[PDB]
Structure formats: C-alpha cells, structure tokens
Chains A and B, each alone.
With several copies, the nearest count.
Chain A
Amino acid sequence: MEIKRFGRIREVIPLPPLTEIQVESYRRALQADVPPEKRENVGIQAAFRETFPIEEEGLVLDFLEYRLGEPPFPQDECREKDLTYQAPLYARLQLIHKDTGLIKEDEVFLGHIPLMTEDGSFIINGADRVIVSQIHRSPGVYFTPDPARPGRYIASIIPLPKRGPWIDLEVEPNGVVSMKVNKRKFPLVLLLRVLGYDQETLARELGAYGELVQGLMDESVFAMRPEEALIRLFTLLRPGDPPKRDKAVAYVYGLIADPRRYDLGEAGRYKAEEKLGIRLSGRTLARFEDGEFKDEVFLPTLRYLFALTAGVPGHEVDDIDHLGNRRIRTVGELMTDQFRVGLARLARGVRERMLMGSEDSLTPAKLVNSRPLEAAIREFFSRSQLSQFKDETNPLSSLRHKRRISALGPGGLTRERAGFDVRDVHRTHYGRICPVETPEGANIGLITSLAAYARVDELGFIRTPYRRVVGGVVTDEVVYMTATEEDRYTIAQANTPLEGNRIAAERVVARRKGEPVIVSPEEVEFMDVSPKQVFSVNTNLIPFLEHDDANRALMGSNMQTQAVPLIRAQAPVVMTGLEERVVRDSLAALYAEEDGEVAKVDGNRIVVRYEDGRLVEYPLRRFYRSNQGTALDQRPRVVVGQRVRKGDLLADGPASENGFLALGQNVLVAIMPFDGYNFEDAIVISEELLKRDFYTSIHIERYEIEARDTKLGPERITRDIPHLSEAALRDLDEEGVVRIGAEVKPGDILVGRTSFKGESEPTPEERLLRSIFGEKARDVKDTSLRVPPGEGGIVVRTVRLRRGDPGVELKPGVREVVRVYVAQKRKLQVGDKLANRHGNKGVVAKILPVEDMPHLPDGTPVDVILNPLGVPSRMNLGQILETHLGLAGYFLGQRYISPIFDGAKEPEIKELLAQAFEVYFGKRKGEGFGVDKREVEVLRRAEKLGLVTPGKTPEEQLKELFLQGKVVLYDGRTGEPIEGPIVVGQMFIMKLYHMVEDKMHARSTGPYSLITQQPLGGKAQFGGQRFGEMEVWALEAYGAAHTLQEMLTLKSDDIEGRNAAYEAIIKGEDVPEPSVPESFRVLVKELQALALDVQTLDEKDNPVDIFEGLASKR
C-alpha cells in the first residue's frame, strides 16, 4: 500500500523535541552531572548560596558543595512496592569559630530528591505523576491608566510571588504623590527622604514637567534627618510597637533591601532595565551599605510616571495580557521554589541550636536537622495542585499532559474569581499558545496547550521561529523571538508564492502588530515557517482542519486523548504527517541504537548484535496495566538474522502500527438515515466488525486486601472459611488465594480471610436454634474478598508483600497484603461511544446482521451508517472530504498525507476518483456484466435531481456520480436500490474510554451514613441516587404528594419506616405509613446546641414529643 503526499510548502526546520519543556528544565535545576566548581548560580545551587552562610550574630556555618547519589531501587521495583524514585542528597559544610579560628568539615545527609524518568514524569509512592507548567504575570515595572479619573496613571512594582509586597505610585488629587504598601497609603517623600534625597536633587531631573514636581517639595520633612525620617516611617508602617532605631532599620531594610526577603527576579530585573532604560546591580528596590540606604529603582520609576502624565512621545502604557508580560514557571523552577522554602526553615533551626546547648563543643552534623527540608519537598510532589495523576490511556494522552499550561495553582488565579479578559485569545498567542485546544466549562481559557513549534526561553518567555526575508528573497536563517520583539516587523504568511526563494506575488498578506495588511514584496522582513506552528500537537492531527468550525475542532482534538488501544489497531487512511513523530517522542516503541544484526527474537526480549561487536538485550513490557486500566504491551516487529540501520523500528508500542499512531480502525461508511436507529447522533454498525475482532480492547483491574493485628486476634488469610461449600472454594489454592488462569464472576471469592468475632452474647432466638441442631458457634467469621457486581474476567497475576521484605514499608499493625490482577477482553456493544477526528461522536444503538446492511452492486456491505442530519448545523465539512478521499483509496489501495492548510484540493481528489472508477467499473465489463436494471431506475431520478447530464450513456452518468463521491446502493432487506445515490467511503473512527460496562449501576438497599442515616453516594460504595431540590420541585408541580413523601421518608432516612417497608414487601403486603425523618431530629438537636428552644405543637398548642420519650428526664 503506497503513500501519496500533497502540499507545496517546504519546511526548513523539523519539530523540536516535544518533551523538552519538562526534560530540559529539570536538568538545569539539578545540575547533577556538572562538576561542583563549574556549576552556575541556578537551580538548587543558587538556593544553597542564598541561605548560607548562617551566622549567629561568633559562629559561622558555610556551604561548600553538594552531590547526588545513586537511586536505591529501580523504577519497576518502586512501582511494585509503592516507593518513590529518588536519589540521596549530601551537603559538604564547615563550621568556623570566629573567636578562636578552628574549623571542622564533614558531609551531612540532607534527604532524597525525586528523579525524573526519561519520558518526563515522576514515580511518587508507586504512581506516575506529571508537573504542569504555570503561567502568571511577569515581575517588573508597569504603568496603567486610572479607571476612575482620566489622564492619570498608576505605577506598580511587582516582585516574584511570595517574595515581597507590591508597591503603588499614584498622584493624588491634592497633588501629593503617595506610596501604598500593605493596604496603607503614606506620602512618598517620607521614604524618598530615607534614601538621602534633598530638595536640590529632586527638582533637577523631574522639574522639567510642570506642576507634578511641586507635589514632591514639602519642606516639613526636607530638613528632617534621614534617621528621624526612618523612625517616623516605622511608626506609620506598624503603629503601636516601641520606636527604636535597632528595630526601625530592621523593618525598612527587611522590606525593600534584604535579598533573602525581597527578590525582583532575573526576569523582573531584565524587564525593569528594558523599560526604564537603567542598569541594576542586584534584584532589590534599594541597596543598603555603609549604614545608609541608597536608591536603585524608585527614582527612575518616578521619572517615567511624571513624563507619562506630562505626555512625552516615548512613554506608553502596558498591556497586562500581552504575552511579553506573561511568563511560564516550569517544573524545575516550581521544585526549586519549594526547595528554598524548606531550606530557610532548616536555617531557622540551626540558629536556635547554636545559641543553646554545648556552644563550645559543636559539629556541623549536630546542628543540622533535615526534617524540615524533606517535608517541603514531599508536600510539593504529593499535595500540590500542579502535581497531577498522569493520564496514560494511550501514548498521545501522556504527551499532551506534559505540554499543558495552567493559570491556577498556588500563586495563580482562582476558577471562580477569573473574569472574561483573562480567558480570551490574545493576538500574541499566535504561534505560542494553541487557540482551539481548551476544556469547555468552568476551566475554559484557564488551561491551554503549547504550540507545536514553540519553546520556553531561560527567563520563561515563549518564542516562535520566523524566517529572515531580505530584499524580497527568503533565506533559511531562522530566528526565535518573543512577542515584544515580534511587534517591530512586518511578517508575511507561509503560503506566499515563491519562485525558488524569490517572492512572486505583487501583493503579500502580512501582519503588523497582530493585524492583517497588504504590502509589497520589498516591505517584508520575516516569514512564517509553516502553518503547523499556530496549533498544538492534538490539533495538528486533524486533516482538512480548514473546513471545520472551531467549536467542533475543539471536540475532535480533545477526544483523541480518550481513545483506547486496540488489538488490531491501524493507522488512518488520510494522515497529516505528524503520526510518525508522535510515536517516536513518546518513547513507547523501541528503536535500534545503531547499525547491527538481530540475533534473538522473542515475545519477551530482543537481542541485537551491533557492528562494534557488543550484544544488547531489550526486555519487552507485556500486558502492563496503566493508571486508567488499559493494557500496554510491546510487540516485536523483526526476525532473526535481519539487518537493521540506526533508528529502525524494533517493536511497536501501544496504539501504533509500524511506527505510526494508530488510535482506531478504517471502516466503510454510508451517510444515510436508517429506520430511526440513527436518531439524534446514534450510530448503527454491522455484526461483521465483531466477527473479525475490530474495536476489541483489553482492560485490567486490580484488587487488594490486608491482614492486620487486632485486639481480639490476628486476621488470617486461609482457605478454611467457615460455613462454605466446596463449590465456593474450588478455585482457591492451599494458601487461600485464587489460582492463576481461573475465570471469576460476581460473587466469586478472590482471597479468603477470617477475623475473630467481637464479644457479644447471641439473641435468645438464635440460642434456641443452636440448641436444636446441636451446633457450637465458632470464634471466627467470614471476611473474604469477592468480585463486585458487574465485574470479572481472568486472573493473570498475584502479588504478595510481607512484613520484613526488603523495600516493603508496611503500616504499623499490618501483617501482609495480597493483590490480584483480573483481565477482560471487551468487544463493541450497544452503549459504547465512537468518534472521529472532526468532532462527530455517538453511542452504538444497533448491531445488524450482515444480510441486513446496505451493500454495493458487487455484494460488499458497509460497516457503519451515519446520519446526514448531524453535518449541516455543526459545519464540520472535513469529515465529508476525508470520506471522498477514502473512497478513492479503497479501490486504488493507497494511503495519503494531506497537511493542514496546504494539502489536497477537490480537483486533485476528483482526478483520483476518476482512476478509481476505472477499476471499480472496468473490472465489471471484463467479467461479462453490463448495467443493472436497478441502476437504470436510479439514474432516471438522478437527472431529475440535476445530478447527471441528460443525454449521456449510463456508463458516463455513473462516472459523473462517482466524481461526487456517490454510488448506487442496494437495500439488504428488500434487494431494491435506495431511490437516490448515497455518499459512501472510508473513514477513521476511534473507540473511546467511556463504556456502558463501567457505568450501569442499581441498588435496592445498602450502606447508610453515620450522622444523617441517609444512603451513601457513588457506584463504588453501592450508593443511591441523589434526589435533589430541582427534582423535588418537579414532583410538587405534578401534585404527586404520596410519591414525594416516600422518597423523603420511606427510602432515605425514616429508619423505622424503611425497616417496616422491606418486611411488608417480602410478606406480600402494602407498605405502611411513614414517620418523622431522622435528619429533622438532627436539626432540632443542633438548634438546641445553639441555645434555641424549638418545640413541635398540636392543634391546641400543646407540646408533642417526637423522641418517643427517650430524651425526657423522667
């Protein structure tokens, strides 16, 4: 099956590594392999040098270097034993006695740092997790207008999150310039005096504006000494505390000048220098030295504010949603932030220990307690909003998870308090953030995806590539630039016609600061690389995207993440060209390292002898269970003695076919209504799909149980369970565990367990019963593990962990734990959900035998019938064009690649359909068959519909219908043709994760809640359905008083009523009258706890007791 490629645009660079946002950021933070003397002041190395040295204020503790050790356990062992994949951390510290001059050095153990796997994830307590990148406002200096009063501006200084307070500079109506700090507004001159600024200094530079400088010229504080001004400022900041200079300088220096408390950031310092046109020595607002404060940023910020208000041409306001003002915090920065938090706590315990207890006899190891540091790191990797359970339904699911961008999390926005403006598609999103891939609902615009060609720079700003255009010719030089840098040029579109490298069009479509213009070739300065750089990886997998509405393209890209792997999965007939790279970068398949020869091929491992002579053996993951329950295994694709080149495929991974992404099947589709089984998105399929094992997938479930120590005695896992027949114990081995290979059904025992009965004398009726049969009560009871309703399959694995085993950390009191893995093979059934890449989805409602399906004149039946009424109002025409191209490939036996916005057009599709008709109809004529009597009838109507040309021969009119994608179709039930030609072709359809097998649930009675005594919720708990307020309104509008009362009392929490109702039904009686609900009794008691006397009365205002006299004091 050959592959045909469309398109004209030639890409000069390939896609970057698709997981480099995760992988490269975490390597920079750790610097694990860089020698200690060559390490740069980034990552955790920068955190060590910030907290150290620690001084008592004559003892000093200093930091020299660190190193990372080998992990204790491998990745697969951590998954099986529920461990964390980590590495020990060691620090090399020295203690110096200032009074004496004696030094001691030793290496102290600091704890464990989690390690990232090769694909870019973590193993935390045995589970795979992903750290999601966070977007937030960049630090710096910003100028925005005053919303209340026109012509006025506000200057803001923003540090890194939790690294200082915000500073506001505003010109008050009275003319006084004010500075607001921590919800408190005070005149700026008071602080501006502390920085040693006199009346002669201020008016020299800012006096060239007019009336604004007069508001900074108060003589009440101008003569005041900076020390007096310092104390006065302290009183305003925190009134009530005693004014002392020692306390005063501590507060002012620690608010704007302490590097350990205020941090502008590398990005913030870079932004401040670019805007104000200054150069900063540090990352603080002011610099304290020689016993005085010196200004660094306050003066240049004030000059910009005054000049902006005056109206100088060169000063403009800032757009806060501009992508040059928003930056990304990746996993390395997020981890390092918590590392610095926990390190500051460690230094706080060092200080309290070095001034109390054996001061003369100290060692560095005795001072350092690393418990605070380990708790900070453990908390981040377990209970952070950005640390999420990994999505691995298919290899594409995990790739998308690693490129998501979230505005939520600690230091971010909130879902409820986010407005419209922060959710919009900004013009700078072009080439950096995908405009279509986002969740619908409360998270729309707050979670997004990185563009396919984008990359995050060292300061956290997203850049996109462009090609340099000089003198009308396009060069291959590629420049990555940010949004702020991009605004200065005229950028042409990627589809601009070229004659080699020369621009051929006279009029060129271009962007200037985000808006379309028409320009001459001599005005162009840059060019787009490809149309693929505007969208994300998921959106780039949808062919004919230019013919689909964006609201339905959002559904198509999202649902590709939910497709489950199939045992006979195949690659789509029509592809875009990203299917190979997705499989390669997901690390799910196996490739050869260099040239060699295959020596051994097996279902478990492959051995390759490379041309240098060395043998490398590759084990294969087989029948592994993912986080979502889908089976992940690798199948070999080579034979013994086969020569391979570097990068050749060795074994396919899940949902791949010869190295291409394979999320479904290619089926024959007819577009027509069918007897109402297609009604409102429902789908009809053929029984022939089941016969050849299409849409068949494998799922694995895990079950667990524990044996504990109790006061009454230990629980025992055993085969000898009381009161059980041999039919129940048939599949258990001698240890009480089900044998491997057994078939289990609901109610079957998996692991047998007994527990010691609690001390309780029996009821009198039971005592007489035991006397009659002469049976002695046992001391243990059945507590074994059984299959839940609606589940089952084949037992494929057992795991047994015991106390004392190496690496096993069981909780106190737990003796052993047993785990059982059960696998089932699922075929397509009524109630299962199907979808295509253009957003068309629906559940299977009918399965028909093969002789019932519509069929071609040569006897071939179709596989799927889709309703044409779902197309017009959704405006997703891409599925129609995919069907037309799939019809040509069905007869020609070829597949196609059509890139988005540069691909297959109708004249090319119609030229392929003309070749396919010559084999679809020319074959018939050679075999000795003409035109059917039934086809002549359909042709007669077809020219009354204006579909064919009158006067042509039947063969010529059948070809006219084929070029429109339509054929004559016969009815399987009657043998007569459909009255009009029907669109028939080949389409790629996926089977989604949502199956009716996992969702059907029912309940009669079961567990109840503790306090309210109402039924529990959830299928996993065997809970009932919530009958909420709006449901109660519907029953009231119907006038169904007795039906409403049953749900309120007899079926939720009337304890006496629900017991009597059950006993009446099993006796063949009608249910009795209900009584007071229990939750009303709770409300009365809770109101009495609030010292409120609530009483129920009768017609005569006499009290009525609703507690049966159980709560009345005699």
Chain B
Amino acid sequence: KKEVRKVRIALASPEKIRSWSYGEVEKPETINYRTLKPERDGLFDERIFGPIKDYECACGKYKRQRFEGKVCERCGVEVTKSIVRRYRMGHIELATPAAHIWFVK
C-alpha cells in the first residue's frame, strides 16, 4: 500500500522496549535434553516467540487454520503462522541498571 520514503533511527526508552516484547525470558534453558522441545520461560519458548509449526499449539489441542488469532487456554500459545518466530522479540528485566557500551567507549 504505502511506500517507504524515509528511514529514521533514534534511541529506545525502557518503556518502548517493554512494548516491543511478547514476554520476559526468565530461564537460561534452551530445549529439553530428551524430547528436544523448547522449555517454558526459556530462550526458545513458544508462548513468547510463537509456534514452531503452522497453526499448532504446544499441547496439541488445536491443529488447523480455522482458529486464527486464538490463544490456547491450556498452553498459552497463539495459533498462527510459524514465521512470526523470525520477528517477535522478548526482554530481560535487569536487577540493577547497566550502561550501553556504545555511549561510553
């Protein structure tokens, strides 16, 4: 529709960073060592970053396209396309503030 005519770059506030994210990463876990599935609250969680295959939740209650825009009430995973996993961000809440090294060195 609309065409891109300009690109702007600026600083990001803490309040803007929290509006980007779909959840907070609380654990350093990647995946289960036996089932090879992402762990809850980890760096690959489906409830934050989206489903791994199209229109399929973690628990398996939903498996088809008809429930588009729906969130499972059991696993908490949105039923949508798996390509959102390239675009959805998370965030980490620090216990104490830290400086950005670009604006220091």
CB distance from A1085 to the nearest CB of B (A): 7
The answer to whether A2 has its CB under 8 Å from any CB of chain B is: no
Given known pairs A1091-B12, A1091-B100, A1092-B11, the reply for A1113 and B22 (CB within 8 Å) is: yes
Chain A residues, Cβ within 8 Å of B3: 1098-1099, 1104
Given known pairs A1098-B3, A1104-B4, the reply for A1088 and B87 (CB within 8 Å) is: no
The answer to whether B59 has its CB under 8 Å from any CB of chain A is: no
CB neighbors of B among A1070-1087 (8 A): 1081, 1085, 1087
CB distance from A175 to the nearest CB of B (A): 41
Q: Are A1106 and B9 in contact (CB under 8 A)?
A: no
Per-residue contact bits, chain B 18-42, to A (CB 8 Å; 1 contact, 0 not): 0110100000000000000000000
In the complex formed, the residue of A with least CB distance to B11 is A1093
Chain A residues, Cβ within 8 Å of B105: none
The answer to whether A290 has its CB under 8 Å from any CB of chain B is: no
CB distance from B70 to the nearest CB of A (A): 13
Given known pairs A761-B63, A1088-B89, the reply for A1113 and B5 (CB within 8 Å) is: no
The answer to whether A873 has its CB under 8 Å from any CB of chain B is: no
Q: Are B16 and A1106 in contact (CB under 8 A)?
A: no
Q: Are A1088 and B2 in contact (CB under 8 A)?
A: no
In the complex formed, the residue of B with least CB distance to A1106 is B4
Q: Are B11 and A1107 in contact (CB under 8 A)?
A: no
The answer to whether B84 has its CB under 8 Å from any CB of chain A is: yes
The answer to whether B7 has its CB under 8 Å from any CB of chain A is: yes
The answer to whether A974 has its CB under 8 Å from any CB of chain B is: no
CB distance from B6 to the nearest CB of A (A): 4
Chain A residues, Cβ within 8 Å of B100: 1091
The answer to whether B75 has its CB under 8 Å from any CB of chain A is: no
Q: Are A1093 and B9 in contact (CB under 8 A)?
A: yes
User: Which of B10, B17, B81, B102 has a CB less than 8 Å from the CB of A1110?
Assistant: B81
Chain B residues, Cβ within 8 Å of A761: 63
Chain B residues, Cβ within 8 Å of A1094: 7-9
Q: Are A1081 and B89 in contact (CB under 8 A)?
A: no
The answer to whether A1097 has its CB under 8 Å from any CB of chain B is: yes
The answer to whether B88 has its CB under 8 Å from any CB of chain A is: yes
Given known pairs A1091-B12, A1091-B100, A1092-B12, the reply for A1110 and B6 (CB within 8 Å) is: no
CB distance from B49 to the nearest CB of A (A): 11
CB neighbors of B among A748-765 (8 A): 760-761
In the complex formed, the residue of A with least CB distance to B50 is A1110
User: Which of B4, B22, B87 has a CB less than 8 Å from the CB of A1098?
Assistant: B4
Q: Are B19 and A1113 in contact (CB under 8 A)?
A: yes
CB distance from A929 to the nearest CB of B (A): 86
Chain B residues, Cβ within 8 Å of A1097: 4-8
What's the interface size class on B, roughly?
Answer: 20 to 34
Q: Are B4 and A1111 in contact (CB under 8 A)?
A: no
Given known pairs A1081-B87, A1110-B87, the reply for A1099 and B9 (CB within 8 Å) is: no
- Residues of A in contact (CB 8 Å), total 25
CB distance from B20 to the nearest CB of A (A): 7
Q: Are B7 and A1093 in contact (CB under 8 A)?
A: no
CB distance from A768 to the nearest CB of B (A): 15
The answer to whether A358 has its CB under 8 Å from any CB of chain B is: no
CB distance from A1001 to the nearest CB of B (A): 31
CB distance from A1110 to the nearest CB of B (A): 5
Most buried by B among A1081, A1095, A1111: A1111
Chain B residues, Cβ within 8 Å of A1110: 80-81, 83-84, 87-88
In the complex formed, the residue of A with least CB distance to B89 is A1088
Q: Are A1111 and B16 in contact (CB under 8 A)?
A: no
Chain A residues, Cβ within 8 Å of B5: 1097-1099
Q: Are A1092 and B10 in contact (CB under 8 A)?
A: yes
Q: Are A1104 and B2 in contact (CB under 8 A)?
A: yes
Q: Are B10 and A1093 in contact (CB under 8 A)?
A: yes
Chain B residues, Cβ within 8 Å of A1087: 9
Q: Are B11 and A1098 in contact (CB under 8 A)?
A: no
The answer to whether A1101 has its CB under 8 Å from any CB of chain B is: yes
In the complex formed, the residue of A with least CB distance to B21 is A1113
User: Which of A1101, A1107, A1111 has a CB less than 8 Å from the CB of B6?
Assistant: A1101
Given known pairs A761-B63, A1093-B12, A1107-B87, the reply for A1088 and B6 (CB within 8 Å) is: no
The answer to whether A100 has its CB under 8 Å from any CB of chain B is: no
The answer to whether A1096 has its CB under 8 Å from any CB of chain B is: yes
In the complex formed, the residue of B with least CB distance to A1011 is B86
Given known pairs A1110-B81, A1111-B84, the reply for A1092 and B89 (CB within 8 Å) is: no
CB distance from B5 to the nearest CB of A (A): 5
CB distance from B98 to the nearest CB of A (A): 11
Chain B residues, Cβ within 8 Å of A1106: 4
Chain A residues, Cβ within 8 Å of B81: 1110
User: Which of A1081, A1091, A1096, A1098 has a CB less than 8 Å from the CB of B17?
Assistant: A1091
User: Which of A1081, A1088, A1091, A1096 has a CB less than 8 Å from the CB of B7?
Assistant: A1096
CB distance from A1079 to the nearest CB of B (A): 12
In the complex formed, the residue of B with least CB distance to A1076 is B4
CB distance from A290 to the nearest CB of B (A): 53
Partner-A contacts on B (CB < 8 A): 2-12, 16-17, 19-20, 22, 53, 63, 80-81, 83-84, 86-89, 100, 102
**Which 4 A-B residue pairings sit nearest by Cβ, starting from the closest?**
A1111-B87, A1097-B6, A1093-B12, A1096-B4
| 9 sampled A-B residue pairs with Cβ under 8 A | A761-B63, A1081-B86, A1085-B86, A1088-B12, A1088-B20, A1098-B6, A1102-B2, A1110-B81, A1110-B83
Known: A1081-B87, A1095-B7. 13 other contacts (CB 8 A): A761-B63, A1088-B20, A1091-B11, A1091-B12, A1091-B100, A1094-B9, A1095-B8, A1096-B4, A1097-B4, A1097-B5, A1097-B6, A1097-B8, A1110-B81
